[PDB]
Amino acid sequence: KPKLRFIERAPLVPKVRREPKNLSDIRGPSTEATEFTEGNFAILALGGGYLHWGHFEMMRLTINRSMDPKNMFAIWRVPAPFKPITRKSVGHRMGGGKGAIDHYVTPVKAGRLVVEMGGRCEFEEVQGFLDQVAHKLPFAAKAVSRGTLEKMRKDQEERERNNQNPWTFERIATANMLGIRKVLSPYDLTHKGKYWGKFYMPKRV
Amino acid sequence: SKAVTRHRRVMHFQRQKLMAVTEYIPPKPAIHPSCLPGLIRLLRREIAAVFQDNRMIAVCQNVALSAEDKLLMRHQLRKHKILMKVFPNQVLKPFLEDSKYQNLLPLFVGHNMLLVSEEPKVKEMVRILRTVPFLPLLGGCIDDTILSRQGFINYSK
């Protein structure tokens, strides 16, 4: 079935316990699903954000529009909306508990692949509508091949080996050089200064 | 303000000073590096076989025609055993020095088409070319002797 299957608004089994918005599901490098698995092309996230249902319909709709099913297949990597984001009632005062469940959401961290592509297709064919899709996403994203992915990771190794700057973030933060863990996160010792909030600094070594 | 926000949150000022001190510095060399220092053999065998084939050769500037007009020229020279050849001069300039044609090195440039032959209908080809007030006869070479267009009048006559 070489198309994007329908992604529902909310799973069949509900989630009756409300959840705290643990926003470290947006922060940082993703661990799950960073590499390709029988794919050739993808929509890599250069930053974290939340996917609604309407984003999933923007991807399924505007990809399955311009797609050759005899030439190209595609797989969701990001699962269905499972995080229950609540909203209190409109124009009501504070307190009184936590608001009722409004709509579900997936968290997507940076470095996550969202939609894998595959088949008898070149990258320059698929740059177009995956760049349109990559611009309709809430976070900054990018259409990435396999050789472009290993290309930019080898680029990041070149940046980390070429810089004539003696002072990196890793040497300052982990050694606590200028007493500077007073200003840094505990996550900045493992993000190594390339993540601020949910964003991602690719240019920053 | 939360740790994850929708806008890029303002850093603390020593956070920002660390970010500026630990910027990426690219390496600078002392000298910029940019300021430092099958079908081809098909044409070689094919046209090199055309070199040994022909006893007489001629050539023109055959770009000045239409498609069905080049079909008419193709049929009226198909009436003879002469052949017409559109091929790049890019490979033909090493072709001439391979075939020891030093008087033919100043000949083959621009738009040109070979008229390789063993039997001269080239006077009657001129009879086809006199009705069209263009497309001149460029000089040939029968058996390592050059033909000017005056020599095409003499030999073709």
Binding site: E125, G128 | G38, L42
Partner: peptide, 23 residues
């Protein structure tokens, strides 16, 4: 031969056709 490189040219033309779809 001749039809080898003619075949290679026709596959290159097919490739440029499959690239020029979105443009």
């Amino acid at each position: 031969s001749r039809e080898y490189w003619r075949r290679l040219r026709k596959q290159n033309i097919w490739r440029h056709n499959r690239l020029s779809k979105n443009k």
